[PDB]
Structure formats: structure tokens, C-alpha cells
Ligand binder design. Structure first.
Ligand code: DCP
Ligand code: CA
Ligand code: CA
Ligand code: CA
Length: 341
DNA sequence: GGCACTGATCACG
DNA sequence: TACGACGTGATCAGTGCC
């Protein structure tokens, strides 16, 4: 199987630059202003001029200003990037019926039936990078190999504005030399559990007892890691169906006063229902981000779809179930809808 | 023993 | 004033049930 992975470059920043060209060359920082105070919130993404200096996704907007006080800071316009994205994705649908849209800026294409080899694959990529630059003037890195995982690792190595192949032979080299923490799906918490077992390379997972690996990271993560190690990772490209749609808002000040929380909950419900558009949920979950940042939640499944009215009333009951079952203070309240009809 | 749901955990964008 | 005017998919461990 031959898989082609497309990953738009520093996306939110790039789309901003494309909407206002004068921004090119200057460091740009797309942020999420929380509203609490002057410059509170986090950074969603920074273009490369800004990343060179340590300004990356996740750091507090105030920390980014200490580093680049004169960078152009813009407010995240998620709806905008989303539309640009949908237009770029549509373009990719001309290159394979089998396409898996991983996220807002990543797509997997199974080109097994469009090219006979990596040479033809690599040329299809180029054609695809161009087609996107033409129509939308957006650069994107292309990763290519036998499966989704190595295609992704491919791209990770090529970006920005690059392209790369990882043939069967390099896959074997990587199964041996590639740091196991750079394997899609291996977060910090797991990477550690592995280093705590002397596992640093994919191959190292074949010499350990299965249950010892299972017990430490989980049966699913172990099998995952093992198949990649045996070089038998097979996961077909499948059209993704959004399973849930929610929204979580930060409150002006923490608290556990139902009446002072309601507005935020109903607000979250409103936006959620807007985003639902035509999709009817049968399950509603109220999510809370306690003062100490833990995540608490309570839900309910109905044998029928949920009218907004039902969501409104039922959400309050669940919010309560969280107040009667926890004593900490809430910082971020929200709703989350699933099990669509 | 094993299928099927629920609140928490991890990873990632 | 130290992970978000942020989100979503997947697995896990507990437990209800034939
Ligand atoms: N912590 C994060 C990570 C990503 N994103 C959003 C903004 C990014 O622009 C977009 C795509 O994610 P990537 O991790 O691919 O980041 P970039 O596209 O910005 O950069 P690059 O792909 O060049 O590394 O998702 C976000 O809001 N918060
Ligand atoms: Ca990415
Ligand atoms: Ca990207
Ligand atoms: Ca990692």
C-alpha cells in the first residue's frame, strides 16, 4: 500500500498571511485571548519567523511578548481557517476517492490505485503541492510511505514546505533507529513509561514480554507498537465521521454557585447547537474544568434525539450532579454532545 | 468468561 | 496571572448482565 500524507505548514499563521500579504517575513503569532486580563490566554501557532525564537503553540501570550514584543499578534479566527481548509481538502479529493481527513490541516490519501511506485508517488505529491499553491497559495509538506504512520513520520521530517518518501528499506532502518517518542501516538506520559522499560526504539518492543508491555502502557498501545515493529502495521484510509461536538468556556472567575454558572452553560449549549446543524444528539455531557485543572464530567443517553430545550434542562441536572459529587471550584464549564442519529 | 455502556486518561491538533 | 474567547477521537478500568 502507498500512502500520501498532506500537512499544511504552520496553518493558522499562513492563512492569516495569505489574507494580508504584508505579514510575510514578519513573525506572526495567532493567539487565543481568554478574556480574564490583558494578554491572558495561549498561543495557537506561530509562523516560522516567530518560532525561531521559542514562540510556539501552547505558551502563554504574555511569555510570547517577552520574547517578541513587536511580533504581529492576531486573534484566532477558527471559522476562517476552517473554510480555507475545506477548500484545500476538496482539492485533494481529485487525487483519490479514499481520503481520511485527520484534522483541520492533515489528510491521508491512499494512492495505491493511482501510482505504481514511489517515483510516481513522489511526482503525484509535487503535483499536489502545486495544485494547492495555485488555487490557494498555501504551502504544505507531503509525506509518503507504505502506511499512515510512516507517511506521517515522513512529513514530520520534511516540513516545512517539503516532501519525502520513506521506502521499505528506510522503514526497516527506522524500526531500529527512530526514537520511539517520535512515533505518532506516543505522548509524554507513555514515552516515559517506555524509557522506564528501556524501550527507546520500536524494535525494543519485540524483545520484552508482551504482558509486561501491556500492563505498563495498555493492550491497545502495545499491539499498536508491536505491529509497527514487526513492520505489519496495516490500517486502511477511512472516511472520518465526526462523533461529537462540544464547547467549553472559561468563566470570569471560578465558583460553584449554580446560578452564576448557568449563563456560561447555556452559552456553551447555544454555540454547540449552532455547530450541530442538522445533527441530532441522543447523549449530552456537561464538562467541567475544576480550579485545579482536573476534568470532571457527567452525561446521559436518551432513547431519542435531544431538543435544545431538553439539553437546557438536562444540562442543569448534570451540572448539579457534578456539584453534589465534587467540592472543588469550577473554572471552565461546558457541554459536549454525541451519539448522533 | 465475555458483551455492552460510563467517567477518566492520553495524545494531538 | 504558569495549556486556550479549544476541540475531538480512542482506550481504559470499573460494573451491570446473560
Ligand atoms: N497546540 C495547538 C496545536 C495546533 N493548533 C492548531 C493551529 C495550527 O496552525 C493547526 C495545525 O497544527 P500543527 O501541529 O500542524 O501546527 P502548524 O500547522 O501550525 O505547524 P507545523 O505543521 O508547520 O509544524 O492546529 C492549536 O490551535 N493548538
Ligand atoms: Ca500537524
Ligand atoms: Ca501543520
Ligand atoms: Ca511524542
Amino acid at each position: 500500500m502507498i500512502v500520501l500524507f498532506v500537512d499544511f505548514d504552520y496553518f493558522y499563521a499562513q492563512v492569516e498571511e495569505v489574507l494580508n500579504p504584508s505579514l510575510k517575513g514578519k513573525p506572526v503569532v495567532v493567539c487565543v485571548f481568554s478574556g480574564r486580563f490583558e494578554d491572558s490566554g495561549a498561543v495557537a501557532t506561530a509562523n516560522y519567523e516567530a518560532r525561531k525564537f521559542g514562540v510556539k503553540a501552547g505558551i502563554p501570550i504574555v511569555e510570547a511578548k517577552k520574547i517578541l514584543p513587536n511580533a504581529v499578534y492576531l486573534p484566532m479566527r477558527k471559522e476562517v481557517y476552517q473554510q480555507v481548509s475545506s477548500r484545500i481538502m476538496n482539492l485533494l479529493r481529485e487525487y483519490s476517492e479514499k481520503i481520511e481527513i485527520a484534522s483541520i490541516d492533515e489528510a491521508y490519501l491512499d494512492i495505491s490505485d493511482k501510482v505504481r511506485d514511489y517515483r510516481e508517488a513522489y511526482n503525484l505529491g509535487l503535483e499536489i503541492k502545486n495544485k494547492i499553491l495555485e488555487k490557494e497559495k498555501i504551502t504544505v509538506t507531503v509525506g509518503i510511505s507504505k502506511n499512515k504512520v510512516f507517511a506521517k513520520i515522513a512529513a514530520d521530517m520534511a516540513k516545512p514546505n517539503g516532501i519525502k518518501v520513506i521506502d521499505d528499506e528506510e522503514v526497516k532502518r527506522l524500526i531500529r533507529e527512530l526514537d520511539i517518542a517520535d512515533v505518532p501516538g506516543i505522548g509524554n506520559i507513555t514515552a516515559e513509561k517506555l524509557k522506564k522499560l528501556g524501550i527507546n526504539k520500536l524494535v525494543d518492543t519485540l524483545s520484552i514480554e508482551f504482558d509486561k508491555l501491556k500492563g505498563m502502557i495498555g493492550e491497545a498501545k502495545a499491539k499498536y507498537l508491536i505491529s509497527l515493529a514487526r513492520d505489519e502495521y496495516n490500517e486502511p484510509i477511512r472516511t472520518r465521521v465526526r462523533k461529537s461536538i462540544g464547547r467549553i468556556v472559561t468563566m470570569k472567575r471560578n465558583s460553584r454557585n449554580l446560578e452564576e454558572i448557568k449563563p456560561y452553560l447555556f452559552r456553551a449549549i447555544e454555540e454547540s447547537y449552532y455547530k450541530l446543524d442538522k445533527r441530532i444528539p441522543k447523549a449530552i455531557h456537561v464538562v467541567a474544568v475544576t480550579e485545579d485543572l482536573d476534568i470532571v464530567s457527567r452525561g446521559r443517553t436518551f432513547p431519542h434525539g435531544i431538543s435544545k430545550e431538553t439539553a437546557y434542562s438536562e444540562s442543569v441536572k448534570l451540572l448539579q450532579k457534578i456539584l453534589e459529587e465534587d467540592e472543588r471550584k469550577i473554572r471552565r464549564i461546558g457541554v459536549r454532545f454525541s451519539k448522533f442519529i
